[PDB]
Design a protein around this motif. Structure first.
Motif, short mmCIF file in Angstrom:
data_model
loop_
_atom_site.label_atom_id
_atom_site.label_comp_id
_atom_site.label_asym_id
_atom_site.label_seq_id
_atom_site.Cartn_x
_atom_site.Cartn_y
_atom_site.Cartn_z
N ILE A 104 -2.98 3.64 -2.96
CA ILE A 104 -2.52 1.99 -4.11
C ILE A 104 -2.42 0.91 -3.07
N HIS A 105 -3.10 -0.09 -3.17
CA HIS A 105 -2.97 -1.10 -2.49
C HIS A 105 -2.81 -2.60 -3.57
N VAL A 106 -1.91 -3.28 -3.18
CA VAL A 106 -2.02 -4.15 -3.68
C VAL A 106 -1.80 -5.96 -2.60
N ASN A 107 -1.79 -6.93 -3.64
CA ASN A 107 -2.39 -8.26 -2.96
C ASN A 107 -1.95 -8.95 -3.71
N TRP A 108 -1.33 -10.10 -2.87
CA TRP A 108 -1.70 -11.91 -3.79
C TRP A 108 -2.04 -12.68 -2.65
N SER A 144 0.78 -1.39 0.41
CA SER A 144 0.24 -0.45 0.25
C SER A 144 1.03 1.28 -0.13
N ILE A 145 0.40 2.52 -0.68
CA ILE A 145 1.12 3.32 -0.73
C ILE A 145 -0.12 4.63 -0.85
N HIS A 146 1.22 5.57 -0.41
CA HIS A 146 -0.13 6.32 -0.03
C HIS A 146 0.72 8.05 -1.25
#
Lengths: 330, 330
Positions: free
Chosen positions: B230-234, B218-220
């Protein structure tokens, strides 16, 4: 039977507050409001309507156990304090206060009196889909919450707003004001009670005439194990069927929950929709008919001196979170 | 008619890029990969293709105009540098590289040589909804962009995962790896070119046996006029009809667009759906028959030494953003 009074009708949210209680069994004992027009609306809706000329009179009234308020936000703190000191518990609209100083003074008074200080964080407590999502999550439906995403947009309606809506000293900043819902929600889903603001931002982008009004805000949050983002706006488009397309995504290890709080675009009729993505597949749940336990849980707390409804520590900590973010945002 | 070569096919997006250029009318001249099982597969899908036993022979050949790659990610940098000095243009899977050091080098050489270093940011360029979003946003369909929320979960699968995928030095971090998509999207919609990473987080909350792998990120992000999250996953759950429910929200002064790229849970068939909220109303738009102009626009860049496909500045800026985010997460 608990009797309560409404003191300060400066915001719309008072109706939801008061109905919430009425729905749960409590009885409305009257209300104070200097403004004629604000009071006219209120008597219309609540028929018995005894309008008291002086706040102090409601405060000094031995038979009234609870004060509900939605006064000008910056004024709520001192009202709540007067209330507590006269032996009343209190349910106030979000934000409960607009500065660290006030939060400080409220915590001391709540310590000095053991009165309950509750904030009706309505986007949680008045939304069955998120109450619902709450129950699923505790019941293991998605595993561990990895990441929460709160997105809330609101309709500005500026011609409609009161002068203090735009004054920064009175309304508290966009994050204090409307992101506090999502802050509380962040602490609810995690089940943790303390969190860190990693970063925050506020801005005025679309209403250059109203410069002290923040128009957009957002915040990045974390509890070691869980991480979170929050964006809020006063930017709901004219074409939107409601006041805001509020969303909550709750990313877990086993699964993801999306809550569409109010609308489904070009989708299903109504609000509030829950979509579970699990080990087994994708389910739409309609949550409209789930029960909103807060009024029962909170009149219980008033009775048993407990905190079934929302830990008091968390009630305060959601404000602290939102204030921090507001601060570091500026 | 351009001719081009695949060097390193360690990740499938290669198929995407080759197919992307084939579709555009360019001509596959041969390919190189040490591994035979990968060479076999590739041979099977492209019957025409002459396998070259040495990377240097394709490099040294003065008839191939472009090298296309998707090698182990850390090794993508060295390869890309060789191509350009050897007179060739380059198009590479994301991430373009896995360290500032590589990025620094990459910019020097590209600037020396005049070649085109291009990353196929697939989740943008190979996503017709999002291309459609872009044209809408450019038209003036929602006014100024105020906030961008990119939400990007992926399905882990390993299972199908080579050994370098779980190696920090090799894959680059989750944010370098899968959050690069979102970074470029941010710069694209914002129409700007420098932005700032306000904060960023990463973790491994689900896969303790891959202690070097990043589960969640995640990033602001910001640009003084625009903000981004932004958020990202596996973490795509096992029941998901696809690899991930990616969503993109663009908040405007007068409207909002939500793109659900891959799936509409429990609603509509396929992706990539775009929802527009407007002064006038709410419209679902279908986007499956909109054209992906990256190819046509890329080859023409090679032919004319222009940058209509993407700005070269931007290509790098996205990588820098995802790297600083990556870096600042420890």
């Amino acid at each position: 039977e608990l009797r309560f009074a409404a003191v300060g009708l400066n915001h719309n949210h008072i109706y939801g507050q008061v109905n919430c209680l009425l729905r749960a069994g409590a009885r409305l004992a009257g209300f104070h409001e200097k403004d004629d027009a604000l009071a006219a609306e209120f008597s219309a809706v609540y028929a018995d309507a005894r309008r008291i000329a002086t706040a102090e009179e409601i405060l000094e009234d031995e038979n009234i156990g609870l004060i509900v308020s939605a006064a000008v936000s910056s004024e709520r703190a001192e009202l709540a304090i007067r209330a507590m000191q006269h032996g009343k518990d209190v349910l106030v609209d979000k934000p409960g206060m607009t500065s660290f100083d006030q939060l400080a003074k409220l915590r001391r008074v709540q310590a000095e009196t053991g009165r309950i200080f509750s904030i009706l964080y309505s986007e949680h407590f008045e939304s069955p889909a998120t109450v619902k999502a709450g129950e699923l999550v505790a019941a293991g439906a998605i595993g561990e919450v990895v990441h929460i995403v709160g997105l809330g947009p609101h309709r500005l309606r500026r011609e409609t707003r009161p002068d203090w809506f735009f004054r920064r000293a009175d309304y508290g900043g966009i994050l204090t004001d409307i992101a506090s819902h999502q802050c509380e929600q962040f602490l609810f889903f995690t089940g943790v009670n303390d969190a860190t603001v990693l970063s925050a931002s506020v801005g005025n982008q679309s209403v250059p005439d109203a410069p002290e009004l923040q128009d957009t805000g957002s915040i990045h949050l974390s509890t070691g194990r869980t991480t979170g983002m929050i964006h809020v706006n006063w930017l709901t488009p004219e074409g939107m069927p409601t006041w805001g397309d509020g969303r909550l995504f709750i990313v877990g290890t086993s699964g993801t929950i999306e809550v569409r709080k109010t609308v489904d675009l070009a989708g299903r009729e109504g609000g509030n929709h829950l979509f579970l993505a699990d080990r087994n597949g994708v389910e739409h749940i309609d949550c409209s008919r789930v029960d909103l336990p807060f009024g029962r849980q909170f009149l219980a707390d008033i009775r048993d001196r407990t905190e079934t409804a929302m830990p008091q520590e968390r009630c305060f900590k959601a404000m602290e979170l939102a204030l921090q973010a507001q601060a570091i945002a500026e």
